[PDB]
Amino acid sequence: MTEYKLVVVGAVGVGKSALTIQLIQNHFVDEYDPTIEDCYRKQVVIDGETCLLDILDTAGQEEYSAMRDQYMRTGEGFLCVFAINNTKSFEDIHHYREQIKRVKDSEDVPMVLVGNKSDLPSRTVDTKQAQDLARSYGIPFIETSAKTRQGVDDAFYTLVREIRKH
């Protein structure tokens, strides 16, 4: 059956691991080693079509490695994650976006922009400015909380739809 290869990228601490573990294991893990990169696989059903998701939860020290480049070439879609209380992580999106397009040598790569930690009160990044950036990229924007589950399945499933459309 169909497999979708997803790569979760973004600055350290934005919640890549928390998002991935919430999606797969349905619980919020609050102090997951920042240095661990790993693959999470799970069978799921999406719009009826039964699926295998292969999700790469990236670690920052691997950024310029030959292995990262191969993983990006293999990856079919990218969840580009920032935190809504961390402006720098939002500004880093530009960097990850350009890297993915370069490494995969394409201007149209399946992607979703994710603004995580939506449960936190101290917002520094407006939804509108994230929506504006996503529009400029021509990709969906989904706001999530790995802690509460809000938006998590939508983020990942929407990325699968983006891969289908491609």
Ligand X SMILES: Nc1nc2c(ncn2[C@@H]2O[C@H](COP(=O)(O)OP(=O)(O)O)[C@@H](O)[C@H]2O)c(=O)[nH]1
Site residues for ligand 2XH per CB under 6 A = 5-7, 39, 54-56, 71, 74-75
Contacts to ligand X from residues 8-67, by CB under 6 A: 10, 12-18, 30-32, 34
Is the CB of 38 or the CB of 49 nearer to ligand X?
Answer: 38
Please spell the DSSP secondary structure of 72-113, one letter per residue. HHH-SEEEEEEETT-HHHHHTHHHHHHHHHHHTT-S---EEE
Polymer length of the chain? 166
Sign of the Cα torsion 124, 128, 134, 140 reads positive
Contact stretch for ligand X (CB under 6 A) within 67-75, 103-111, 112-120, 126-134: 112-120
Smallest distance from the beta carbon of 15 to Mg ion, in angstroms? 8
Smallest distance from the beta carbon of 99 to ligand 2XH, in angstroms? 15
Is the CB of 34 or the CB of 52 nearer to ligand X?
Answer: 34
Smallest distance from the beta carbon of 60 to ligand X, in angstroms? 7
Beta pairing, strands 49-57 & 38-46: antiparallel
DSSP code for 142: E
Is the CB of 33 or the CB of 166 nearer to ligand X?
Answer: 33
Ordered alpha helix ranges (H), the chain: 16-25, 66-74, 87-91, 93-103, 127-137, 152-165
Is the CB of 34 or the CB of 126 nearer to ligand X?
Answer: 34
